[PDB]
Amino acid sequence: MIVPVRCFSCGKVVGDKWESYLNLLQEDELDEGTALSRLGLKRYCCRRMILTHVDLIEKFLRYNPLEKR
Amino acid sequence: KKLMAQIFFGPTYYQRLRHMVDDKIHARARGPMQVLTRQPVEGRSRDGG
Amino acid sequence: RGPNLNIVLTCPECKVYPPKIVERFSEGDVVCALCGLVLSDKLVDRVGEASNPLLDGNNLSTRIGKGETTDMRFTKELNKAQGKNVMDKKDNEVQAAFAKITMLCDAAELPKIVKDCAKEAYKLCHDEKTLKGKSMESIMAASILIGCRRAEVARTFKEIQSLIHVKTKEFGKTLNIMKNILRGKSEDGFLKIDTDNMSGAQNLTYIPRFCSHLGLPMQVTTSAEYTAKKCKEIKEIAGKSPITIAVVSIYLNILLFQIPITAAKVGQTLQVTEGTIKSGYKILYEHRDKLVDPQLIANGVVSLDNLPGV
Amino acid sequence: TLKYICAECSSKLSLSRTDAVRCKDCGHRILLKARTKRLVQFEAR
Amino acid sequence: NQEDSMIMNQSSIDRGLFRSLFFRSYMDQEKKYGMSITETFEKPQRTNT
Amino acid sequence: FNMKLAINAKTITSGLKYALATGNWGERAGVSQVLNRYTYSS
Amino acid sequence: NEVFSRPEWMILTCLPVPPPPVRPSISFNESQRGEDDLTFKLADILKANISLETLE
Ligand SMILES: [Zn+2]
Ligand SMILES: [Zn+2]
Ligand SMILES: [Zn+2]
């Protein structure tokens, strides 16, 4: 629902590359493969972590908080 | 060491089914009995037989 | 008096009375918590039908119905045989009255607790020497009113008269007799503290329903509830009927909140005379400060000048 | 006595035993128990 | 991994592979059987219960 | 004659509620089922 | 058989009543007193027998 911290297979930290992955797609107009290779994800185990991730936390954040401070 | 046979390798979509072992492991040495037949009850949630 | 036939689970080694006894339900044992000795093993943790021996008594009856292969001739004779029984005539009429209780409550969309309370109130007040000459509809109406009052959900006399066609005098006398015999049965049986459930006024419980009949918002309803609560302090209107107090509080808070509902519409909806509502508003205009919620006018949602003068 | 939060308006309320379970601000009859004040420990595995 | 078994990576499991949330909701109501036979949501004590 | 007593709305209400709560369709079983919410495709 | 099954014993004139172990009274929440179906049938048999006795 949010980007995993580490790649499942090898353990490379991919959780810090998610926000820069979206920038490479929306304002640099790169295709997904070049955006993955630019971030340093050269193993397809790491590439499937970012490429196949679904950001379901954005849908969860549209609901109003139950306990609002 | 290298394996003599090369391995088919790659990503595949896998689904986690709702059958866990922890929801299915069951044992009973002695427990409650039925009111009618006085035999062990049915169901692991009731410590059954 | 009578045979004992009582089993006590006491540890024969600790000899402590009362014993610390653990019922290990998962292992099916009854053990002593001090030494661990088991007392009774193979304990019992569907197949029949639920039957509470408090609403319909200890009556066990089964009806005859059509099966997979059933002739029509045999069913009718058995139904007539079951109907022609003389020993359950009292049971038959009390079940008929319970069916009428369910029919009247279901025609009012009353909750199930009202049905249960009315049924047990009818059962407790049934077959009373002091209650023999009253009409069945009066018993019906008073049982429904008692069931409404007991569940903190009380309706008014006009509601029950709107459903059940009963004269006011006989309904009031029936209610008084059933309240007396209910207090007598409570004293004879389990004593129940009233804690304002048989209250005559109960004007806090009429405000939300009467506001719903007018389609008012919530804050008007709570302002009317506060106004009706503070109307008890006013000695000039303390003798008024709680319907009239609730209606004049609702109308005062309608004028306070600028809700476009006239006095004629309030009088038509809740069957209160428009002159009565106008007189209640006139007599409550002098006490505007106490009736209106101070935090509402502090937050500025309403102001006291919105109320028209007399 | 015990703290609750209304389900839709998210207003903190204090309810006793005799109080009917109902929001005092927006009137929603669904109330959530407040999260406990004691600190709860989680293994990070 | 014989006869439909599979070998999962434990290190992958440690990083969240197929880790799931499980929610279970318990419903309970206090029902009024009659006048004195009513249920109450309370913390029971061993002295009087 | 009271119209509130003439029309028992509980007949319609309880009939629809019973035939939708249970699978029974009458007075055919399994017509109404609890909706599966294991996955979205389910 | 002369000793174990006579045809005259095929007609029921003294109905045996099974003990409550045969027909236990279940509890739905340990406050209801729901009885077995055999208890209900025996109650109906007793009601019919009393009705026939009173009619005769
Ligand atoms: Zn990797
Ligand atoms: Zn002991
Ligand atoms: Zn609220």
Q: Each residue of C112-127: b (16+ CB within 10 Å) or e?
A: ebbbbbbbbbbbbbee
- Are D21 and D31 contacting, i.e. CB atoms less than 8 angstroms apart? yes
Q: Is the dihedral of CA C132, C138, C139, C145 positive or negative?
A: negative
Q: Is the dihedral of CA C72, C77, C81, C83 positive or negative?
A: positive
C-alpha span between B24 and A32 (Å, rounded): 43
Q: CB-based contact (8 Å) between A6 and chain E?
A: yes
C-alpha span between C134 and G28 (Å, rounded): 39
Q: Which of B29, B32, B36 sits opposite C43 (nearest CB)?
A: B32
What is the distance of C-alpha C256 from the center of its chain?
33
Listed in sequence order, the residues at least 6 apart from G44 whose beta carbon sits closer than 8 Å to its beta carbon are C60, C61, C62
β-partners of residue C29 are C24, C41
Q: Chain A, 7-36: which have a CB under 8 Å from a chain E CB?
A: 7-9, 11
Please report, as a single letter, which amino acid is at residue C270: L
- Are C148 and C205 contacting, i.e. CB atoms less than 8 angstroms apart? no
- Are C27 and B31 contacting, i.e. CB atoms less than 8 angstroms apart? yes
Residue whose C-alpha is closest to residue B32's, from B13, B47, B20, B45? B47
Q: CB-based contact (8 Å) between B11 and chain A?
A: yes
Q: For residue A57, give how far its alpha carbon lies from the nearest alpha carbon of chain B (Å).
A: 21
Chains D and B touch (3+ CB pairs under 8 A): no
E28 is catalytic: no
- Are D11 and D25 contacting, i.e. CB atoms less than 8 angstroms apart? yes
Residue whose C-alpha is closest to residue C246's, from C275, C215, C217, C223? C223
β-partners of residue E32 are E38
Copy the structure tokens of residue B30: 């002695």
C-alpha span between C102 and C108 (Å, rounded): 10
Whether cis (ω within 30° of 0) applies to the bond prior to C18 is: yes
Q: Interior CA angle at C181 toward C180 and C187, to 5°?
A: 95
Burial class (CB in 10 A: 0-12, 13-18, 19+), C224: buried
Whether E35 and C116 lie within 8 Å, measured CB to CB: no
CA C272–ligand 2 middle distance (angstroms): 72
What is the distance of C-alpha C91 from the center of its chain?
24
Copy the structure tokens of residue C131: 């209650």
- Are C18 and C8 contacting, i.e. CB atoms less than 8 angstroms apart? no
β-partners of residue D2 are D15
Overall number of domains in chain D: 1
**CA B18 vs CA A56, B15, F39: distances in Å:** 21, 10, 11
Q: Kindly write down the DSSP assignment for every residue of C149-211, as one continuous string.
A: HHTT----HHHHHHHS---HHHHHHHHHHHHHHHHHHHHHSS----SSSS-S--TTTTHHHHH
The DSSP H or E segment spanning C114 is helix C112-124
Picking from C54, C191, C197 by the largest number of E CB atoms within 10 A of its own CB, the best residue to mutate is C54
The DSSP H or E segment spanning C21 is strand C21-24
Listed in sequence order, the residues at least 6 apart from A33 whose beta carbon sits closer than 8 Å to its beta carbon are none
Experimental technique behind these coordinates: cryo-EM
Burial class (CB in 10 A: 0-12, 13-18, 19+), C259: middle
C-alpha span between D30 and D15 (Å, rounded): 13
Q: CB-based contact (8 Å) between A1 and chain E?
A: no
**Angle (deg, nearest 10), helices C242-256 and C263-270:** 150
Percent of chain A that is helix, strand, coil (3-state, to 5): 40, 5, 55
Copy the structure tokens of residue F41: 């495709």
Q: Kindly write down the DSSP assignment for every residue of A29-54, as one continuous string.
A: ---HHHHHHHTT--SHHHHHHHHS--
- Beta strand D12-15 with D2-6 is antiparallel
Residue whose C-alpha is closest to residue A47's, from A5, A4, A7? A7
CA A69–ligand 3 middle distance (angstroms): 15
Give the number of C-alpha atoms closer than 13 A to the C-alpha of residue C236, restricted to the C-beta side.
9
Q: Interior CA angle at G30 toward G25 and G31, to 5°?
A: 95
Picking from E22, E23, E24, E26 by the largest number of B CB atoms within 10 A of its own CB, the best residue to mutate is E22
| CATH class of the structural domain C206-306 | mainly alpha
Whether C186 and E33 lie within 8 Å, measured CB to CB: no
C-alpha span between C269 and C214 (Å, rounded): 7
Copy the structure tokens of residue C85: 């029984």
Listed in sequence order, the residues at least 6 apart from C89 whose beta carbon sits closer than 8 Å to its beta carbon are none
What resolution, expressed in A, was reported for this entry?
Answer: 3.1
Domain span holding position D3: 1-45
Q: Chain F, 8-37: which have a CB under 8 Å from a chain C CB?
A: 8-10, 14
Q: DSSP letter at C304? A: G
Measured torsion, CA atoms of residues C270, C274, C279, C280, in degrees rounded to the nearest 10: 10
* Candidate list E1, E2, E3, E4, residue with the active-site label: E4
Residue whose C-alpha is closest to residue C81's, from G13, G48, G43? G48
